[PDB]
Amino acid sequence: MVKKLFFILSKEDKNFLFFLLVFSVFVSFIETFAISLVMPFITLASDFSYFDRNKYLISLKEYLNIPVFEIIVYFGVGLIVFYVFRALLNAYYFHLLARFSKGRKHAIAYKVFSKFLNINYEKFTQKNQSEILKSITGEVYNLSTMISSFLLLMSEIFVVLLLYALMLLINYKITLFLSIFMVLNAFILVKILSPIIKKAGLRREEAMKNFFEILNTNLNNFKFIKLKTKEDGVLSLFKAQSEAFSKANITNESVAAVPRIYLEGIGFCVLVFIVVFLVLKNESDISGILSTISIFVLALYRLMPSANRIITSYHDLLYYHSSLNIIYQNLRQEEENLGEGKLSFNQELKICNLSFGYEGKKYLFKNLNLNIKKGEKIAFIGESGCGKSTLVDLIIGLLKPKEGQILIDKQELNASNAKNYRQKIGYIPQNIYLFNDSIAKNITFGDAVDEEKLNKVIKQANLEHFIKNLPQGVQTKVGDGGSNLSGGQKQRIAIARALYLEPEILVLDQATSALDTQSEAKIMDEIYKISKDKTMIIIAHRLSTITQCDKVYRLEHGKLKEEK
Amino acid sequence: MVKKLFFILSKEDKNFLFFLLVFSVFVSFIETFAISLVMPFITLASDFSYFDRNKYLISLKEYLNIPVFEIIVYFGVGLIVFYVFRALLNAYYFHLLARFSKGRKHAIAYKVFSKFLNINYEKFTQKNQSEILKSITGEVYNLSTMISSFLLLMSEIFVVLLLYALMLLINYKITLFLSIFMVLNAFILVKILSPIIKKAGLRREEAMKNFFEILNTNLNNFKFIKLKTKEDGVLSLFKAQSEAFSKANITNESVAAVPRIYLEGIGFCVLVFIVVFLVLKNESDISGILSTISIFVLALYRLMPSANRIITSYHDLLYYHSSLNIIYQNLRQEEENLGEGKLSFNQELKICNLSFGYEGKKYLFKNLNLNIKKGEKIAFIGESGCGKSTLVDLIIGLLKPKEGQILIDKQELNASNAKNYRQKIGYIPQNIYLFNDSIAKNITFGDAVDEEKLNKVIKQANLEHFIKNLPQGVQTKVGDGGSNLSGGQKQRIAIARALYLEPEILVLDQATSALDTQSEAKIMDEIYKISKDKTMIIIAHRLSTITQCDKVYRLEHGKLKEEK
């Protein structure tokens, strides 16, 4: 199950991962350094003696660039250099945690998306973009965030270990005491107060509900009240409920405050307790009294986040991780389509005993039979969801027929040539999705440009009077779908996009309703013109768009009739 | 605006308030005590001397009751006693703040609700119960809240004053230094980092948006992609947007960390700087001068919440107060109805030239004319919102006619007699709002009980075979409206409630639809029987339910015609 993780992660990824591990432990040390360096600095900044015994300190003293006024000062400068240094080290560590997680999100998202773009058409189709978006987006977030969380978890569990070690070394007695005390407060808060608070909250809820209940009905009985004259009865009932509510409210609020108040007080108390019992055993009073206390204090506060991060991040390995890691293996060992080798289209697309059903699912056809002479311009009339869109989806490359054939010049369309067959159909979806970019792209669908092919295509789709009257011209961002674009231009742009692949079969998957019949008529006329040298299938939703079709088939549950 | 507050507050309210003021200041003292007491306790726990100098200490010493091992111990016990006391004082203080605010919500809500119950029927009627609920409930909450916010605001600005005074005494130089340091850092955060953070955030928002946009457009063009075969274009556009998102994400996340990291570093640094600049002064009393840093630390940390509380509560006086305080005076210097003195009903209710409109609002009638013989049992047919309900509202006490009269035994109904008139009509609304209580109340409508009158009335409204098969019976909570009750019992209990006032005019306001005759015909007959010795007005929504009526008037836009 790490094999998963190291499969999903690249080489640079795995390396980066290990660097970040090491780095995590190293900052655990730099943390405990920052805490403990307070001990010697404070114990040597007072008392000034120490350079009067002890070989090392007096050796320093007799490096003589300074007396000791200036030695402690240099020591301070070294300390604030170190602390600045540590601030930088920590910033960089968190920045590298970000860099790792977000970079990995970028990489794994891209790998997953690619993986999806390669499954077969029905497979992609049969699940909702809600979930496919979740699959390449939310999951990748989870993995990323979680790995970073693990690294942070490491660094902090070592801060806890090292710091606890330090405390034990300096005064195992006190640290044992502080710890017993720690779990003691933990128990008091979480097992004695939290329940009382929670109840107080429920009491408040119920009392509020009841108060508002009879306030509301008293307001609803206003007419009956007004016809009594006297209002003392309801005011009575209301007073009683309002007192219940008020009371439960003052005690929920009262009890709520106890935990912080308790915390303030216990802090001071345990401090006094430490000095009153541990002034009975000393081992030198002086400034030393602050030396051993400060550490604990420091340590304790530094350990406060250590807890939280360790808790928080642990939860992140719970809620994410597990469920998620599999969802990559079982999403990127995902299988793709197939096929390679060509296929020619000069006579007819024959269909032959088609029959198709989606993976569920009773067939939509059974034994559909038709054929299309090259150039034929046909249309599929139908009762929408009767199967005509699916039919076209079979006639064009996508979707494997449950029973038919589909021959192209008497040659069977299948896995081996489907690439080359798919390659020869333009698409034109009427309700079109452009992406936010420079018209040229879309039209090219990314693929560089070709200026010439791009221009000839724009000319064909008669967008010429549009790309002339635009500021940036062919490079105008289209805002989204548009935003910058209106239906007619969107449509012509989609037509253009289709004509950039060029030939030889145009599908026109017209959407339902247009409320711009004039424009739809014009675009229809244009499309017919530009389908002169080509052959065209129309997934027709109207009629009146199909005036110029050589053939019209109506497909209804679940037979094909020729109409024309 | 204080005249407002003290108009709203009672005497007991004001007293409690000034008490809470004084108490607030007193806890400011005990807080600064809690801080400063660490100084002597730790300064006398080292060095053990002082009981050999200082007249007071050495006199205490030569109270000779113990050595000094034990005197410091006594001082310590005195401390944890003081700290416990302080915890108690604070818990009690916040409990008193709660007790005040909620006690005041309780009282002022009650005053407002009562105020509303006394305005005239049209006024109450002409506004939505949303607003009347908010006016006696949400506003009251606001005021209460805001007063407590103010008391805490006091307590905390005084904690700041006193503590800051302490710091100044202990080391005027240092406190000035740290204050400069404080506002300096504040400028760093709030004016140097925070803007960078927000930009980083907006950048992330935008890059995210673009990433997800072309991801979705790409998922939406899957059919077009699959028909290309080649997918490198969309994968490319996707890579570019995804890298943008990645970059903006890592640097928003990176910059997010700088502020706390900065805070850590600057803390330690300013500490070291404090020891290095203040070891430059021939005074390093080993632990003595070194005692005084701790105070500053403590104080600074105590001043943090004071800062927060002062901000929060200031904002609470902003958001509320101003807006809320006024909407009280202007909600309780509100004027009420009027009247006192009687009016007798033995022959006819004469109506005469009515003409009525709601305050808007074109009239519903002009010249309505009818009269009701005592005992008559009449019904108002109409096109439901044709005005019949408004008409009844005028015939009974509520609503002042724009032009008519309404005479009761040739005597005018008006402000002087309206009370006694209202007093003599029961109401029975068919679709009735009960409150959550012991069926006796509802039926009595709060007003104590009378048992004999209550039992007789229960028998009148034929509820006896229901109160037989009930657990608690007449004391059964009826569960919200019911819940515990089904339509028939609601209707009969309403009839009871009405008969409990007793006489002399029963209004029956039938709802639209009952579906159908089975229940409603039955209750109609029960009602007709019990309306024999009385006179009755029925606001009929059908027909067919008013067969047994002596008179029936149909009122339609906007004249009154007699039918039967």
CSV table of N, CA and C in Angstrom, one decimal, chain A residues 47-119:
chain,number,residue,atom,x,y,z
A,47,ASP,N,24.5,34.5,36.9
A,47,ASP,CA,25.5,35.5,37.2
A,47,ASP,C,26.8,35.5,36.3
A,48,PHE,N,27.4,36.7,36.3
A,48,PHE,CA,28.5,37.0,35.5
A,48,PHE,C,29.7,36.2,35.8
A,49,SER,N,29.7,35.4,36.9
A,49,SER,CA,30.8,34.6,37.4
A,49,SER,C,31.4,33.7,36.3
A,50,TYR,N,31.0,32.4,36.4
A,50,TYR,CA,31.3,31.4,35.4
A,50,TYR,C,32.5,31.5,34.5
A,51,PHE,N,32.8,32.7,34.0
A,51,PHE,CA,34.1,33.0,33.3
A,51,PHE,C,35.3,33.2,34.3
A,52,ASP,N,35.0,32.8,35.6
A,52,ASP,CA,36.0,32.9,36.7
A,52,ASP,C,36.3,31.5,37.2
A,53,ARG,N,35.5,30.5,36.9
A,53,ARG,CA,35.9,29.1,37.0
A,53,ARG,C,35.8,28.5,35.6
A,54,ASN,N,35.8,27.2,35.5
A,54,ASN,CA,35.5,26.4,34.2
A,54,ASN,C,36.5,26.8,33.1
A,55,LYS,N,37.3,25.8,32.6
A,55,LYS,CA,38.3,26.1,31.6
A,55,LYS,C,37.8,26.8,30.4
A,56,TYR,N,36.7,26.3,29.8
A,56,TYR,CA,36.2,26.8,28.5
A,56,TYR,C,35.8,28.3,28.6
A,57,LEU,N,35.0,28.7,29.6
A,57,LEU,CA,34.5,30.0,29.7
A,57,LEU,C,35.6,31.0,29.9
A,58,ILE,N,36.7,30.6,30.7
A,58,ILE,CA,37.8,31.5,30.9
A,58,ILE,C,38.7,31.6,29.8
A,59,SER,N,38.7,30.5,29.0
A,59,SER,CA,39.5,30.5,27.7
A,59,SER,C,38.9,31.5,26.8
A,60,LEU,N,37.6,31.5,26.7
A,60,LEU,CA,36.9,32.5,25.9
A,60,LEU,C,37.2,33.9,26.5
A,61,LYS,N,37.2,34.0,27.8
A,61,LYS,CA,37.5,35.3,28.5
A,61,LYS,C,38.9,35.8,28.0
A,62,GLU,N,39.8,34.9,27.9
A,62,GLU,CA,41.2,35.2,27.5
A,62,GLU,C,41.4,35.1,26.0
A,63,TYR,N,40.3,35.1,25.2
A,63,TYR,CA,40.5,35.5,23.8
A,63,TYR,C,40.4,37.0,23.7
A,64,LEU,N,40.1,37.6,24.8
A,64,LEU,CA,40.4,39.0,25.1
A,64,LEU,C,40.1,40.1,24.1
A,65,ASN,N,39.4,39.8,23.0
A,65,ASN,CA,38.9,40.8,22.1
A,65,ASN,C,38.0,41.8,22.9
A,66,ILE,N,37.5,41.2,24.0
A,66,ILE,CA,36.6,41.9,24.9
A,66,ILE,C,36.7,41.4,26.3
A,67,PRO,N,36.1,42.1,27.4
A,67,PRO,CA,36.0,41.6,28.7
A,67,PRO,C,34.9,40.6,28.9
A,68,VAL,N,33.8,40.9,29.5
A,68,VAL,CA,32.6,40.1,29.6
A,68,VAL,C,31.3,40.8,29.4
A,69,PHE,N,31.3,42.1,29.7
A,69,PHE,CA,30.2,43.0,29.3
A,69,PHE,C,29.9,42.7,27.9
A,70,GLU,N,31.0,42.7,27.1
A,70,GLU,CA,30.9,42.5,25.7
A,70,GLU,C,30.8,41.1,25.2
A,71,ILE,N,31.2,40.1,26.0
A,71,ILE,CA,31.0,38.7,25.7
A,71,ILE,C,29.6,38.3,25.7
A,72,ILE,N,28.9,38.7,26.8
A,72,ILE,CA,27.5,38.3,26.9
A,72,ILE,C,26.7,38.9,25.7
A,73,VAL,N,27.1,40.2,25.4
A,73,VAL,CA,26.5,40.9,24.2
A,73,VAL,C,26.7,40.1,22.9
A,74,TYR,N,28.0,39.7,22.6
A,74,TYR,CA,28.2,38.9,21.4
A,74,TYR,C,27.3,37.7,21.5
A,75,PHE,N,27.2,37.1,22.6
A,75,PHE,CA,26.4,35.9,22.8
A,75,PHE,C,24.9,36.2,22.4
A,76,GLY,N,24.5,37.3,22.8
A,76,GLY,CA,23.1,37.8,22.4
A,76,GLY,C,22.9,37.9,20.9
A,77,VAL,N,23.9,38.6,20.3
A,77,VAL,CA,23.9,38.8,18.9
A,77,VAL,C,23.9,37.4,18.2
A,78,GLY,N,24.7,36.5,18.6
A,78,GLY,CA,24.7,35.1,18.1
A,78,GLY,C,23.3,34.5,18.2
A,79,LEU,N,22.6,34.8,19.4
A,79,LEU,CA,21.3,34.3,19.6
A,79,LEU,C,20.2,34.8,18.7
A,80,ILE,N,20.2,36.2,18.5
A,80,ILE,CA,19.2,36.7,17.6
A,80,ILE,C,19.5,36.4,16.1
A,81,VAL,N,20.8,36.2,15.8
A,81,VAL,CA,21.1,35.7,14.5
A,81,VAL,C,20.5,34.3,14.4
A,82,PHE,N,20.7,33.5,15.4
A,82,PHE,CA,20.1,32.1,15.3
A,82,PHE,C,18.6,32.2,15.2
A,83,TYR,N,18.0,33.1,15.9
A,83,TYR,CA,16.5,33.1,15.9
A,83,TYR,C,15.9,33.6,14.6
A,84,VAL,N,16.6,34.6,14.0
A,84,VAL,CA,16.2,35.0,12.7
A,84,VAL,C,16.4,33.8,11.8
A,85,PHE,N,17.6,33.2,11.9
A,85,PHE,CA,17.9,32.0,11.1
A,85,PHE,C,16.8,31.0,11.2
A,86,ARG,N,16.3,30.8,12.4
A,86,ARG,CA,15.3,29.7,12.6
A,86,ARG,C,14.0,30.2,11.9
A,87,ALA,N,13.7,31.4,12.0
A,87,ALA,CA,12.5,31.9,11.4
A,87,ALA,C,12.5,31.6,9.9
A,88,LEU,N,13.7,32.0,9.2
A,88,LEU,CA,13.8,31.6,7.8
A,88,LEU,C,13.7,30.1,7.6
A,89,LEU,N,14.5,29.3,8.4
A,89,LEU,CA,14.4,27.8,8.2
A,89,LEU,C,12.9,27.3,8.3
A,90,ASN,N,12.1,27.8,9.2
A,90,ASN,CA,10.8,27.4,9.3
A,90,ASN,C,9.9,27.9,8.1
A,91,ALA,N,10.1,29.1,7.7
A,91,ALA,CA,9.4,29.6,6.5
A,91,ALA,C,9.7,28.7,5.3
A,92,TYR,N,11.0,28.4,5.1
A,92,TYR,CA,11.3,27.6,4.0
A,92,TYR,C,10.8,26.2,4.1
A,93,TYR,N,10.8,25.6,5.3
A,93,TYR,CA,10.2,24.3,5.5
A,93,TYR,C,8.7,24.3,5.1
A,94,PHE,N,8.0,25.3,5.5
A,94,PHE,CA,6.5,25.3,5.2
A,94,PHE,C,6.3,25.6,3.7
A,95,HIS,N,7.1,26.4,3.1
A,95,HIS,CA,7.1,26.7,1.7
A,95,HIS,C,7.4,25.4,0.9
A,96,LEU,N,8.3,24.7,1.3
A,96,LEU,CA,8.6,23.4,0.7
A,96,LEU,C,7.5,22.4,0.9
A,97,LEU,N,6.9,22.4,2.1
A,97,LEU,CA,5.7,21.6,2.2
A,97,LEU,C,4.6,21.9,1.2
A,98,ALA,N,4.4,23.2,1.1
A,98,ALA,CA,3.4,23.7,0.0
A,98,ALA,C,3.9,23.2,-1.4
A,99,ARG,N,5.1,23.6,-1.7
A,99,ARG,CA,5.7,23.2,-3.0
A,99,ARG,C,5.5,21.8,-3.3
A,100,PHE,N,5.7,20.9,-2.3
A,100,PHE,CA,5.5,19.5,-2.5
A,100,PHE,C,4.1,19.1,-2.8
A,101,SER,N,3.2,19.5,-1.8
A,101,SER,CA,1.8,19.1,-1.9
A,101,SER,C,1.2,19.6,-3.2
A,102,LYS,N,1.3,20.9,-3.4
A,102,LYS,CA,0.7,21.5,-4.6
A,102,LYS,C,1.3,21.1,-5.9
A,103,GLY,N,2.6,20.9,-5.9
A,103,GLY,CA,3.2,20.4,-7.1
A,103,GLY,C,2.7,19.0,-7.4
A,104,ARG,N,2.5,18.2,-6.4
A,104,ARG,CA,2.1,16.8,-6.6
A,104,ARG,C,0.6,16.8,-7.1
A,105,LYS,N,-0.1,17.8,-6.6
A,105,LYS,CA,-1.5,17.9,-7.0
A,105,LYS,C,-1.4,18.2,-8.5
A,106,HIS,N,-0.6,19.2,-8.9
A,106,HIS,CA,-0.5,19.5,-10.4
A,106,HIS,C,-0.2,18.2,-11.2
A,107,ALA,N,0.9,17.5,-10.8
A,107,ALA,CA,1.3,16.3,-11.5
A,107,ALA,C,0.2,15.1,-11.5
A,108,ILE,N,-0.3,14.9,-10.3
A,108,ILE,CA,-1.2,13.7,-10.3
A,108,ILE,C,-2.6,14.1,-11.0
A,109,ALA,N,-3.0,15.3,-10.8
A,109,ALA,CA,-4.2,15.8,-11.6
A,109,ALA,C,-3.9,15.5,-13.0
A,110,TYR,N,-2.8,16.0,-13.6
A,110,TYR,CA,-2.5,15.9,-15.0
A,110,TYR,C,-2.5,14.4,-15.4
A,111,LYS,N,-1.8,13.5,-14.6
A,111,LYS,CA,-1.8,12.1,-14.9
A,111,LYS,C,-3.2,11.5,-15.0
A,112,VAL,N,-4.0,11.9,-14.0
A,112,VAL,CA,-5.4,11.3,-13.9
A,112,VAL,C,-6.3,11.8,-15.1
A,113,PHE,N,-6.3,13.1,-15.3
A,113,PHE,CA,-7.1,13.6,-16.4
A,113,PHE,C,-6.7,12.9,-17.7
A,114,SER,N,-5.4,12.8,-18.0
A,114,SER,CA,-4.9,12.1,-19.2
A,114,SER,C,-5.5,10.7,-19.2
A,115,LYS,N,-5.3,10.0,-18.1
A,115,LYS,CA,-5.9,8.7,-18.0
A,115,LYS,C,-7.3,8.6,-18.4
A,116,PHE,N,-8.1,9.6,-18.0
A,116,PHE,CA,-9.5,9.6,-18.3
A,116,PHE,C,-9.8,9.9,-19.8
A,117,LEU,N,-9.1,10.9,-20.3
A,117,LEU,CA,-9.3,11.3,-21.7
A,117,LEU,C,-9.0,10.1,-22.6
A,118,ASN,N,-8.3,9.1,-22.1
A,118,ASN,CA,-8.1,7.9,-22.9
A,118,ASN,C,-9.1,6.7,-22.8
A,119,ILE,N,-10.0,6.7,-21.8
A,119,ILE,CA,-10.9,5.6,-21.8
A,119,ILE,C,-11.8,5.7,-22.9
